[PDB]
Every structure is written in structure tokens, then in C-alpha cells.
């Protein structure tokens, strides 16, 4: 009735996915094998797990998500891991020789190799599904298939269904921290082929995960376990409406042309809170106002792009748990109140409340403390264009020096893809350039 499905790519990406399905399975508490601890009573009023966990004729409830990546080592760990009763073989599609972070390889070269298997799996699930709203696709501009092969993936999947929503979680090159140097190539080559195949998607950067887990989670020494846990929470709440009763169970498609008013600049930030320790869970109270005012801390901004340097457009503060329409509401007045913040005035307010009544659940072994209320500030501003500009200037020079270009030209891409894709970020620079212009008079 209300389905979504997750797709996983790139090393960090399927790392995220593993964390996620660990999470949801924890949260509905269905045991890793595929059974719930106990029988399910027959009831109505709304869906349940049925969105994602797959009903069998018995205690076998597998996700509705798919793995695809050409670097097949790690995924085997899932193939080995505790959830080897959880998942399902045909759920698993991997490539042996990954891209080597040639975008053009797993996009072009090995792009040709596994696509059809992917699409068949997709047809099996969507055919298995009925009211699948949209598509959860995860990848990374690092684990190279996460850029290339995913690029073809949406490039064709969109042309397959279209009417489904594109739920885009991919990681963005951290501003000064990194993984490689061809990242310019991965990213921008992705981007010009990303945009028109993307509906909307958010940009998760890691350095924020570090700084904030270390200060706010009080973390001393983190890694992808903590990161994947954190994105696990954020996606855990970004879709609760289709999973749990909330006052305004807003929906993705609902989010689509309302958060991203124009068609073009359709990405965003997301600073979840309240992430604190057990020793800050106590020694604190964690007000709605604390999560709320705290929600707009630029230093809390969960992607390393200063909001205060941008002007907000929309903010879908979907809330978990014991939320009051009034209290949050006045907090939103407080958000109108913030002098430092500046909004796409031709969209004076574009707010859209989310009050889901389940407060958050915590993953044992985790660092986040337990609370009563969650916020997701999926918000869109002018600010985020800048780091892009860093990307196209860095890539600008490096590409000017023809660095690495032999690698890509060797695999079947043309140079005008490069300069033209730079025209692509040129245009989007005109977009964040223009939409931020205040309409005259």
C-alpha cells in the first residue's frame, strides 16, 4: 500500500545500508533470522513493517531493498553476517572487479555488466509491491560504483517507472577531508548525469559526523560504525509517517515539489538531534525548544556548509514522540524570529509539520542517549552552492592539468562530458545564484 525500497552501492554506502536494516529490524524488533519473537495480531487502520520487511507464509520477513556494487568483498560479510538468515540470496547482486573509482568504468565499462540483473530484481520487488511510493537509493561518490553504476541505475530506473519518488542518500566529498583526489571527477561526472535523473536527495558529509559525535555524542574515536549508526537514525525518522501514527503523517511525494519549490536545486541539509550521552541524557531535560532551537544551530548543521551563509527555503521538522502542535508551533514562530536567518522571501514560509507520536528507539551498543522527541530538519537554503564551487574549482584546475584523464578517456568517456559537466555546475551555480536573488520591488 505504502512501499519504499532501498538500494545500496559504494563501500560506505552499503555500510550505511547494513546499519539501516539492522536498525529497522531492531525497531520493529523482528529477530534477525526473519521472525518476530511472537505472533502478529490481525488489525487495521494503517500498515506496519509490510512496507519493507517482507511477509512470508511464516516467520521470514525480509527487507524490500537491494544491494548492488562491483566491489563484492565486504557485502559477503553480510553474506556471512548474523543476518544471513535475514536477507535473501537474490537480494544480493555484486560485481567482482569494482570501478577502481573510475566513474566511467562501473558506469560505462562495468556499467554494462550487471544492469539487467539489477532491473530484473527491481521488477521482482515492485511487482511484489503495490503502492510503492518511491525509491531508496544509496551510494557514494567514493566506492566508485556508488557514483558510476548508480548513475546509470537511476538513469534507467527513472525511465522505467518514473512516477515513483527518488529518495536520494549519497555521500558528498567532505570539504577538506577526503578519500581520493579523482573525487572531482566522480562527483561532477555524476552530477550532470545525476540531476536530471534525480528527483531529490540529501548530501551527507562525514566531518560533521565526526565533530558532532565527538562533541554531542561525546565520542572519542569514531568510524563508519558510528556514522552508519547516525544516518541510520536520520533515515529511521525520515519515513516514520508511513510506519507509525503521527499527527501530520506527511509523505515523500508530499515533500517533493514543496520542499524543493523549483525543479532544479532539489537537495538539502539534515541536522538530526537530539544526540547526547547517557551522562547528558541526565544532567539534561531536552525540551522541544531545545531540540528546536538546537535544530538550527549552524554548528549543529549535519553537513559542512554554513546555513548562516545561506538563506533557508523550507524546513520539514518531522518529530518523533510526545510533540505538541502548539509548542513546536511557537518554536516555529521563534524560527521566524531568528534575525540571522533569511528566507527565500518569495517563499515566505514553506513549513510543513511532522509530529509522529513514537519517540525514538535506541540501538544497544550505541552512543546516542535515549530521549522522547526527535527532529529532522530537512531544510533547503542558498548556502550549499559554495562547497560545490570548491568542487568545480579544485576539479577545475586538476582537470585543467589533464590529471588522471587518461584513466577515464581510456574507458570510454569524451572530453566534452567534462567541460560540459562543468557547464552543468555552471548552470546550477546560476541557480543558487538566481533563486537567492530577491525578487525586485
Amino acid at each position: 500500500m505504502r512501499e519504499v525500497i532501498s538500494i545500496h552501492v559504494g563501500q560506505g554506502g552499503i555500510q550505511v545500508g547494513n546499519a539501516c536494516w539492522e536498525l529497522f529490524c531492531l525497531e520493529h524488533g523482528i529477530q534477525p533470522d526473519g521472525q518476530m519473537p511472537s505472533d502478529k495480531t490481525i488489525g487495521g487502520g494503517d500498515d506496519a513493517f509490510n512496507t519493507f520487511f517482507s511477509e512470508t507464509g511464516a516467520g521470514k520477513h525480509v527487507p524490500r531493498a537491494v544491494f548492488l556494487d562491483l566491489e563484492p568483498t565486504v557485502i559477503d560479510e553480510v553474506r556471512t553476517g548474523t543476518y544471513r538468515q535475514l536477507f535473501h540470496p537474490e537480494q544480493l547482486i555484486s560485481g567482482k572487479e569494482d570501478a577502481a573509482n573510475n566513474f566511467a568504468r562501473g558506469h560505462y565499462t562495468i556499467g554494462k555488466e550487471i544492469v539487467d540483473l539489477c532491473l530484473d530484481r527491481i521488477r521482482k520487488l515492485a511487482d511484489n509491491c503495490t503502492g510503492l511510493q518511491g525509491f531508496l537509493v544509496f551510494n557514494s561518490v567514493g566506492g566508485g560504483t556508488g557514483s558510476g553504476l548508480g548513475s546509470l541505475l537511476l538513469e534507467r530506473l527513472s525511465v522505467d517507472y518514473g512516477k515513483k519518488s527518488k529518495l536520494g542518500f549519497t555521500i558528498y566529498p567532505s570539504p577538506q577531508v577526503s578519500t581520493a583526489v579523482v573525487e572531482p571527477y566522480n562527483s561532477i561526472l555524476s552530477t550532470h548525469s545525476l540531476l536530471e535523473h534525480t528527483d531529490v536527495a540529501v548530501m551527507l558529509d562525514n566531518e560533521a559526523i565526526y565533530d558532532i559525535c565527538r562533541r554531542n555524542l561525546d565520542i572519542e574515536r569514531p568510524t563508519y560504525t558510528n556514522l552508519n549508526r547516525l544516518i541510520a537514525q536520520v533515515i529511521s525518522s525520515l519515513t516514520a509517517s508511513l510506519r507509525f501514527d503521527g499527527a501530520l503523517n506527511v509523505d515523500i511525494t508530499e515533500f517533493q515539489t514543496n520542499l524543493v519549490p523549483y525543479p532544479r536545486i532539489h537537495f538539502m541539509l539534515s541536522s538530526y538531534a537530539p544526540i547526547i550521552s547517557a551522562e547528558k541524557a541526565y544532567h539534561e531535560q531536552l525540551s522541544v525548544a531545545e531540540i528546536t532551537n538546537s535544530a538550527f544551530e549552524p554548528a549543529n548543521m549535519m553537513a559542512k556548509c554554513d546555513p548562516r551563509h545561506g538563506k533557508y527555503m523550507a524546513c520539514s521538522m518531522m518529530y518523533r514522540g510526545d510533540v505538541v502542535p502548539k509548542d513546536v508551533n511557537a518554536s516555529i514562530a521563534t524560527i521566524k524570529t531568528k534575525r540571522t536567518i533569511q528566507f527565500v522571501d518569495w517563499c515566505p514560509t514553506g513549513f510543513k509539520v511532522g509530529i509522529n507520536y513514537q519517540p525514538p528507539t535506541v540501538v544497544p551498543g550505541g552512543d546516542l542517549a535515549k530521549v522522547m522527541r526527535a527532529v529532522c530538519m530537512i531544510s533547503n537554503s542558498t548556502a550549499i552552492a559554495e562547497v560545490f564551487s570548491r568542487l568545480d574549482h579544485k576539479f577545475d584546475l586538476m582537470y585543467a592539468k589533464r590529471a588522471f584523464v587518461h584513466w577515464y578517456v581510456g574507458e570510454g568517456m569524451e572530453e566534452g562530458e567534462f567541460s560540459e559537466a562543468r557547464e552543468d555546475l555552471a548552470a546550477l551555480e546560476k541557480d543558487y545564484e538566481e533563486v537567492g536573488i530577491e525578487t525586485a520591488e
Binding site: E77, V181, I219, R221, T223, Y224, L397, A403
Partner: protein, 429 residues
Amino acid sequence: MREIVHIQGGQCGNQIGAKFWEVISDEHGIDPTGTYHGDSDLQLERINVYYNEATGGRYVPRAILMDLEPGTMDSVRAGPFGQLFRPDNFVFGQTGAGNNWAKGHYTEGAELIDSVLDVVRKEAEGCDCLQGFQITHSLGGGTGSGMGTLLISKVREEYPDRIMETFSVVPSPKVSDTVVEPYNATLSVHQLVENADECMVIDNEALYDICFRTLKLTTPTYGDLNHLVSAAMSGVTCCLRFPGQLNSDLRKLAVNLIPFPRLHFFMIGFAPLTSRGSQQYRALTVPELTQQMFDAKNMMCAADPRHGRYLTASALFRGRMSTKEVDEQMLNVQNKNSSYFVEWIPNNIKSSICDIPPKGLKMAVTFVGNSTAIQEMFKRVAEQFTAMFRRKAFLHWYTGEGMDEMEFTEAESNMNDLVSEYQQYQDAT
């Protein structure tokens, strides 16, 4: 499966790989006999991509023996783990190259290549999705290079998709173990700049310096040295051999290491390196090993990062840590000595981690960065070649092989061209 093979010639290199497979055996804990005696399937999980099970569980290498005289074949044939081998691969010579490289390249070069490339090819059919293969010789003579030149040409043509990561011994500037070195070397390097996919420099004097100063050892041999290098060359495939929260293969490496294909001569750093007392001076941190990583004294090659500039730099980490540290030291260092970091390569440092370090240690570091400091290396060797080629000193041993001198000019203005090429890339912004 991204499995790979090994091929070794070389007056030393034939010993080197002996130590190498020896080390890998330790990291797979399989008996010398060829059956596993370890404690995790993880050693067996990805075992194949170097090894090969046999009927009955004889576990075997994907190695290829090069030699022009069986002594080494007997030597390693006399080797512990020698029962872990396949008698098939003991492909050697009846003459020896005498290290006139033309001898080992035309004379005996053309003489015994065929049986090698055949059986090797049988190994090629034995490989499901061959990531590559590892060649080993030295870049100053012919005991390895004599034929290994022909190998790189032949297999390179025969497998234009496979990776050719080439380690061969570089003559140190000071000690000339032979005087025909500039000529063998230059003639080879002409080839290797064209045909080899990866190369990392193999000095002896660095290895001495490591053993004597930083190892604090007085008694140098080869075997320890090959321990020190097969440590690294053994580390390189770790992620490729074992899981890693941040993995990168040789394709991701080289493609993430080289701007232009002429730059696959790389320098190497591995650590930690202590004598026994040192641990009771110091302990292990990622920042610590980092503080060794950019050490010229671990810079195991004739090139100086202190004199040249890091065109590229990378870290190979095996262990269990927090990458939140790792990156942090990374960027920290990429600032701290920014000047030796080439400019327009943003984030010219790049990362990795293997969930397991090598055996015995808890954390692993490896550095195969690429400055351009090697220019003094080629400049030197080319210089000596220049002098005696003015003299034609020992041309008669040479032209007796029936080469031309114009080839010497070819590798000559060739190799100079490569040097100046590195000059402009170093001298640019």
C-alpha cells in the same frame, strides 16, 4: 577473483619471492606441507587470490620462477616451505645471463622465454578474474631484467588488461655492485617506462640504513631485507585479501595514484621498525606511525622527499583503530609540510584501512607515495652510462651481443626525457 601470480628472476629477486611466499604462508598459517593449520576461515576465505588448493588440499602458490641457472632453483628448492611448492614452475636456465642484459634478453632471452610463457599461460587459464601478477628482478643487470624485460613485453601484449606491478632492484648511487649496471639499467628502463604498469624502487643502501640505524642491526644480509620488503609488498593486497572499512585495490591505487602513466615508479615506506627495547621506550599510535610515515629514513629509495616534492602520497593501514584519527593525522600532515606536497593535487594524500593488521602487530602502516625526487636517481645512472659510453667501456662484452648503440641512445634521450618530464610537473603550479 582478482587473484594474482608471481614471477621472479633476479640475482636476488629469486630469493626475494622465496621470502615473500614464506611470509604469506605465515599470514595464512598453513603448514609447510601445504595444508592449513590456522584458526580463522578468513585466511581461507580469500586464500585463493594468492594460493591454490590442490587435490588433497595441497595449497600452492601462483608463482613463476625465472632463472638462467638452476642454483637458485636448488636453493629455494632447498627451502623450508619447499614442500609447499609445485615442481612444475622450476623454470630456470643452463647458462646464466652473465648480466649482459642483451645476453639475457636476446641470447638467452629468446632462448627460454617460450617454456615460461607457456606454463605461465597455463596459469592464466588457472586464473578466474586475474587482478594481476607480481614480477621481481633488478634494474641493473640481466639475472632478472634480462628476461623480465621480455616478460613484460610478452604478457603485456598477451594480457593488455592485466596489472603489471613491478619491483626491481635499483643500484644505489654509492656502491656499484657492477659497472655494466648503467647499460643494463638504461636499456631496461626504456622498456619499463613503456610496458610496466606499477614500479617501486628497490635500493639496498636504504635497507642497510633501515637495518642498521632504525633497526639498530649490525649484521645485514639479503634475507632480513626481503623480510623488510615482502612485509610491504605483502601488505599491499591486504584489503584485496581481507575486509577493510576503507578498501582500495591496485586499480583504485594506481588510478588513484598516477596522473599520467609515465609515473609508476613509486617509493615505499613501511613501519613500525624498532629493535626490541623500543617498545619499552614507546607505544603505538596512528599519529605515531604517521610520524614515521613521512620519514626520509623510511623513504626506502634513492629519492628524497626532503629534496623533491610529493606528487602523490598514500597510506596503507592494517589493524583496528578509529579512522577519525586516521584522516585527522592525514590532513594534519598534508598541511604541516604543505611545501613538499605538490599544489594542484588537492588532497594529494589518500587513505585506506584493513580490518586486520599483519600478524604479530596490532596496527599497520604503509606508504607508497610518489614525489619526483627520483630525478637524481636517473640523472646519476644516466650519468655513469654517459661517461663510460663516452669511453664505450665494456661495449665489447656488449656489442658482442649484437645490439646497436642507437638503442642506447633511445633509452638515453628517452630516460632524460622522462626526467625532464618530471621536472616540468615538479616545476609547475
